[PDB]
Amino acid sequence: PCLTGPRTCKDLLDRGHFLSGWHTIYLPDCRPLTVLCDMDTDGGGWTVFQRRVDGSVDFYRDWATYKQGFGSRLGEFWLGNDNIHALTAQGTSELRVDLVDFEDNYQFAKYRSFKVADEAEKYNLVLGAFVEGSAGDSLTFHNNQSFSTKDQDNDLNTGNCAVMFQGAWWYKNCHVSNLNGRYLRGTHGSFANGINWKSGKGYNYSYKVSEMKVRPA
Amino acid sequence: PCLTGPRTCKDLLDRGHFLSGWHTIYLPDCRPLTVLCDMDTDGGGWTVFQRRVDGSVDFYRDWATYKQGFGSRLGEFWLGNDNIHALTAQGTSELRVDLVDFEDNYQFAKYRSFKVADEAEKYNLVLGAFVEGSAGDSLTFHNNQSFSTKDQDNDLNTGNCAVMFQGAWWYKNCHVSNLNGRYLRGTHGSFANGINWKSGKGYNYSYKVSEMKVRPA
Amino acid sequence: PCLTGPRTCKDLLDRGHFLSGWHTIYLPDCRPLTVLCDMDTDGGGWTVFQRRVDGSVDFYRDWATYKQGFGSRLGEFWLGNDNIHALTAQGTSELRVDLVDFEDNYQFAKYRSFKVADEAEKYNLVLGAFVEGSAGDSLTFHNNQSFSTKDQDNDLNTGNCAVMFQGAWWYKNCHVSNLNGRYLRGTHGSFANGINWKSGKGYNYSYKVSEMKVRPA
Numbered sequence A, B, C: 001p002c003l004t005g006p007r008t009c010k011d012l013l014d015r016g017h018f019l020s021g022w023h024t025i026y027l028p029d030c031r032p033l034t035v036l037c038d039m040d041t042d043g044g045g046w047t048v049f050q051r052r053v054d055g056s057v058d059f060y061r062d063w064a065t066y067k068q069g070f071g072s073r074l075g076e077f078w079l080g081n082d083n084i085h086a087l088t089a090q091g092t093s094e095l096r097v098d099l100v101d102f103e104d105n106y107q108f109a110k111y112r113s114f115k116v117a118d119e120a121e122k123y124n125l126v127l128g129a130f131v132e133g134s135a136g137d138s139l140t141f142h143n144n145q146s147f148s149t150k151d152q153d154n155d156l157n158t159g160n161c162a163v164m165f166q167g168a169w170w171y172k173n174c175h176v177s178n179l180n181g182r183y184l185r186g187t188h189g190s191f192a193n194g195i196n197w198k199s200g201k202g203y204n205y206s207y208k209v210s211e212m213k214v215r216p217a
């Protein structure tokens, strides 16, 4: 069942599943996981690990909650740090970030490789080169940073980045992207605590849609 | 098939299903049923049997329709009275009611047990003690009453509550809650015919989101 | 699996699946396909093969992409010309087209039979009699015409209808319906390149919702 089953969303596309949606794959350790496949963007076959679309889910969550994953298949979610590690541990996944503003402008960024380490390495981000994208590069800054949540500060700032910027991320001191920030709906006077991508719409605009996704390259 | 399969949304959570969504459970008689699990609210592991979110579905329905269930897995639904009975017949399920107003403020009510009887007993409500909730108690009033729809009047009113308040419920003479009422979108001049919870926002305010859900005690 | 399994959304309804949403059916050759069932409209049991609702998906796509299907189970999609052929080849399906404008007026058209031929016959449209519908008949004009996309012109125009009208359809010279056109959101000055149904809201109005769906006649 593991040995016959699909291992990635790319396997599902290869087997004739052409519509984005939730499907079961088998992780390298043979555990089944139901994931969101994007078969429509940029050739299809992406496994989606983060999705924001309407502000229905609270993303200001603790370490245990980020570790296991949270949210809803009907809408917004974070798939979980243990899962994202399992998906990216071996071989090379590319990363794409898709963003939509409240005027329906679509922007994206793409990186050559993306891996997150295990819990003992604090889900350390190992990110390859910026390839291209109309949103510009707001992630290379975050290479080689631990993941941090409000109750576990692993950042390089003397304060608590997750609390200061009301999110959870691979904060440094502190960010140029904050896609797990608050769903603040376009322009906000609060500083850099929204769904922000600095090179895209800046530190005072919160996107309508965010998706982070991976595929074998 | 059934022997070791999950019996509730709580079993699924215990087995590592951390994302809300539609999953198959095996009812006490081993029939499979695809249900909506809420893995987030209040510890997670709730089986959701009513959901209102945008007024896309007509809830002013007849006895046969309430018996069978109606609506959409992608939006609003009533799971069905035969199914709700099968879910709650054996072994103490708690009830939670989650309500959201049009300014995104959340209120709730929780009850120590909840069951509905079979069709012959008119899906009679058997409700345990109010435990707590910021919405206040607007369901104890309905304890030990038959369900009624427009076309099957088992209420304690000389006329027809379901027609007068455009819903379906365990009406007495007539109600303090009406969550299968019309989707009237906030404050409404019309008396008590909306998605109303008397002790919450009162008889002239119709919530944006209603969910009714159960979990083993 | 196949000879006992459901063949259509109508079989699923007859077997007690009362909620709209995505389910597996078995095509005439026993291939499983996950499809969207509309268990409400006109008694229920329709298999939905096109859905537009918010302009999130690009429908200006090439022949290969129309052939396989594209979009998302979570929103807008085209189920795919090979699939639609398989669904409509044997046993005769009626067609219903559901349309909603931006003021929430609902209109429909219904045809007694609908089939599309295989790829070698360019997914030729074979349409039976108009039965009824408030949207009026804007599909008989397209009877017995090949499907065309921007990169494969099988139309009866000297130029390229798919390009001129920014869609994909059984174009003649060129159209009176264009439901795979651009999501232009109500009135538009551009001529006939939106989600248009001529006999409904005309060549300069793009509907909010369009669904195309089939059921055994």
Ligand SMILES: *[C@@H]1O[C@H](CO)[C@@H](O[C@@H]2O[C@H](CO)[C@@H](O[C@@H]3O[C@H](CO)[C@@H](O)[C@H](O)[C@@H]3O)[C@H](O)[C@H]2NC(C)=O)[C@H](O)[C@H]1NC(C)=O
Pocket (backbone or CB within 6 Å): A144
């Ligand atoms: C990820 O970040 C860690 C810092 O947390 C980087 O570790 C540091 O790596 C540098 C080299 O890039 C180390 O410098 C070397 O130190 C010794 C002297 O102690 C010296 O012989 C060399 O001249 C060089 O300066 C640094 O010590 C090390 N720091 C720690 C605390 O381990 C790591 O390299 C970064 N990883 C990547 C892939 O960039």
Ligand SMILES: N[C@@H]1[C@@H](O)[C@H](O)[C@@H](COS(=O)(=O)O)O[C@@H]1O
Pocket (backbone or CB within 6 Å): B060, B061, B062, B063, B064, B065, C043
């Ligand atoms: N097949 C059902 C019938 O069983 C039902 O009695 C009728 C009216 O239902 S109501 O909920 O709309 O009143 O509609 C549906 O077509």
Ligand SMILES: N[C@@H]1[C@@H](O)[C@H](O)[C@@H](COS(=O)(=O)O)O[C@@H]1O
Pocket (backbone or CB within 6 Å): A042, A043, A044, C060, C061, C062, C064, C065
């Ligand atoms: N893998 C597909 C190709 O097979 C397709 O021909 C091409 C253009 O598609 S279009 O619908 O966007 O024109 O992109 C897609 O990535």
Ligand SMILES: N[C@@H]1[C@@H](O)[C@H](O)[C@@H](COS(=O)(=O)O)O[C@@H]1O
Pocket (backbone or CB within 6 Å): C111, C112, C113, C127, C128, C129, C130
């Ligand atoms: N132009 C079509 C014919 O081709 C068809 O034979 C007839 C009956 O079709 S029916 O599917 O609607 O029974 O209708 C219309 O006249």
Ligand SMILES: *[C@@H]1O[C@H](CO)[C@@H](O)[C@H](O)[C@H]1NC(C)=O
Pocket (backbone or CB within 6 Å): B144
């Ligand atoms: C419930 O109601 C009926 C009257 O409608 C009564 O005969 C019965 O004893 C009641 N049981 C309880 C616990 O109230």
Ligand SMILES: [Ca+2]
Pocket (backbone or CB within 6 Å): A153, A154, A155, A156, A157, A158, A159, A160, A161
């Ligand atoms: Ca810090």
Ligand SMILES: [Ca+2]
Pocket (backbone or CB within 6 Å): B151, B152
């Ligand atoms: Ca009656």
Ligand SMILES: [Ca+2]
Pocket (backbone or CB within 6 Å): B153, B154, B155, B156, B157, B158, B159, B160, B161
């Ligand atoms: Ca009465």
Ligand SMILES: [Ca+2]
Pocket (backbone or CB within 6 Å): C153, C154, C155, C156, C157, C158, C159, C160, C161
């Ligand atoms: Ca031509």
